[PDB]
Ligand binder design. Structure first.
Ligand SMILES: Nc1ncnc2c1ncn2[C@@H]1O[C@H](CSCC[C@H](N)C(=O)O)[C@@H](O)[C@H]1O
Ligand SMILES: Nc1ncnc2c1ncn2[C@@H]1O[C@H](CSCC[C@H](N)C(=O)O)[C@@H](O)[C@H]1O
Ligand SMILES: COc1cc2c(cc1OCCCN1CCCC1)N=C(N)C21CCC1
Ligand SMILES: COc1cc2c(cc1OCCCN1CCCC1)N=C(N)C21CCC1
Ligand SMILES: [Zn+2]
Ligand SMILES: [Zn+2]
Ligand SMILES: [Zn+2]
Ligand SMILES: [Zn+2]
Ligand SMILES: [Zn+2]
Ligand SMILES: [Zn+2]
Ligand SMILES: [Zn+2]
Ligand SMILES: [Zn+2]
Lengths: 263, 267
């Protein structure tokens, strides 16, 4: 039987609680990491936080016009536009503290936090995973990939390379410090896309990673994104993809078929 | 000018937990707009604040941090907040200790007892035009003693940068020595006037970082405050040695900086 292990893995840090369930095995709530809601530093990074360096708008409205300096890819409901390049996404510049606009303007989606109801759950083959507890329309903001900010050289020397997100060159490592997104599994048929966002600062070395639904997501459906080739070139030697989709490109079988395809 | 008019519904532009309206029933002065309202301190040059999460002293509390075992409370001497988020009656309102609130490195929940200042403005305040001191800040409700009012927010600057600034009216003194300058970038607290009989006390607080060069300034009521009462604190002698260009218009029987007070001292 499916049991609710933890009522909130975020410990009240998010807008909504993120419960943890397990109806697959006897694994307890993971506690080998520190849940953080915002990105952290473990060495001097000196993020350029000069308020005068911020590109900002002069809008006195809610920022729905084409005249907003900060195109604005959000619609009235905070969703990415249908015409948004889900293949090669542009950089998003949300409104900030230098903008003359109100805190509740239409260009502050990611900075307003988690709004969708998510659950941490035990998958059959991929350990822990994240699923939707509600229907999620296309282009809705899900969560941010939060972790520890580190150099690519620091990433290369890390014992655990399982929770790394490449920024461009810098990485977010969610191994020791992370949020709900450190539990999102790889899918060869993904339903979320990562987006580089700028909010309170505009230092190009450190974009913030925001996940948006790339299609309408059904209740109970597992969230996942394409981890990319860098992860799968390192990791395939140790384990293969268990997504079980008909389009799987990293399975063991798919790996055996392409290795045999040449000869 | 005769009747009190609402000049702005929210000077904070939705940035605070509550709207901070502006009124004027004294003169023709419109809503001040010669500054940028910010809800958190800003920087205009590298302050190199130590934000290394590993440098944070944090607690191991698995409860709500009400026990004497809370490392964050022990640093503050004891956690000075009561159950309702108010400073204790025994709190040194004359020489306040440094407050270390819980942070992101603490194992405790976001709703623990040691996170008052980091939760923002809860009291209802108004920006209003005073008779003699330009703009001022008053309570739109009764405020018990030890309640958190607002933070003194502004631009972080060196003492050397402060010395060269044309306007020295919005400075709060905190790598050597640093200042908060609310002249160009500030929050509702840049409008709080000096009172020789003050009802608020500034407190040095640490939250997300513990870089001792940069405490955050939190105002707490030093006594029970009545509705409509003007908020004010003692600006101290550094301001009054430079400024007393003009004299104190607080009009209290205890005034130590009025033209009358300065004349009686010298004579
Ligand atoms: N499609 C996939 N197939 C197999 N394992 C996967 C997977 N996507 C993610 N994983 C596993 O999850 C790791 C990335 S971190 C994602 C959360 C992880 N399941 C957990 O329980 O903490 C991978 O290195 C691998 O161990
Ligand atoms: N007790 C006092 N008497 C006279 N002027 C005062 C005062 N306290 C503050 N002020 C005025 O307010 C300045 C500090 S900033 C406080 C807000 C200010 N009244 C405004 O309308 O912008 C002082 O430099 C002085 O100009
Ligand atoms: C093994 O995976 C990676 C390894 C590395 C990496 C990124 C990786 O991850 C790709 C993105 C999958 N993750 C997205 C969030 C969680 C998984 N950048 C690096 N410099 C290295 C090379 C050695 C360190
Ligand atoms: C003239 O006043 C000050 C001048 C200065 C100052 C502090 C002053 O006042 C503080 C106390 C009243 N303020 C509290 C918040 C708003 C006013 N720190 C400085 N380095 C200087 C010396 C030259 C710049
Ligand atoms: Zn705008
Ligand atoms: Zn805006
Ligand atoms: Zn803007
Ligand atoms: Zn797959
Ligand atoms: Zn504690
Ligand atoms: Zn705590
Ligand atoms: Zn703590
Ligand atoms: Zn006075």
């Amino acid at each position: 039987t499916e049991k609710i292990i933890c009522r909130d893995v975020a410990r009240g840090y998010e807008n909504v609680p993120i419960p943890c369930v397990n109806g697959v095995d006897g694994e307890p709530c993971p506690e080998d990491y520190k849940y953080i809601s915002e990105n952290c530093e473990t060495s001097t990074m000196n993020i350029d936080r000069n308020i005068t360096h911020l590109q900002h708008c002069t809008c006195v409205d809610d920022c729905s016009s084409s005249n907003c300096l900060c195109r604005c890819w959000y619609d009235k409901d905070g969703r990415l536009l249908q015409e948004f390049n889900k293949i090669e996404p542009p950089l998003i510049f949300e409104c900030n503290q230098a903008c003359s606009c109100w805190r509740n303007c239409k260009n502050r989606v990611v900075q307003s936090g988690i709004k969708v109801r998510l659950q941490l759950y035990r998958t059959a083959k991929m350990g822990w995973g994240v699923r939707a507890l509600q229907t999620i329309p296309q282009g809705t903001f899900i969560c941010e990939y939060v972790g520890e900010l580190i150099s690519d050289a620091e990433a290369d020397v890390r014992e655990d390379d399982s929770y790394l997100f490449d920024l461009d060159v810098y990485c977010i490592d969610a191994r020791y410090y992370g949020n709900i997104s450190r539990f999102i599994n790889h899918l060869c048929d993904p339903n979320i896309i990562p987006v580089r966002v700028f909010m309170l600062h505009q230092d190009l070395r450190f974009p913030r990673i925001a996940f948006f639904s790339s299609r309408d997501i059904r209740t109970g459906e597992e969230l996942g994104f394409d981890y990319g080739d860098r992860f799968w070139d390192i990791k395939s030697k140790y384990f293969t993809c268990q997504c079980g989709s008909e389009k799987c490109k990293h399975s063991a079988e798919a790996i055996a078929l392409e290795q045999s395809r040449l000869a």
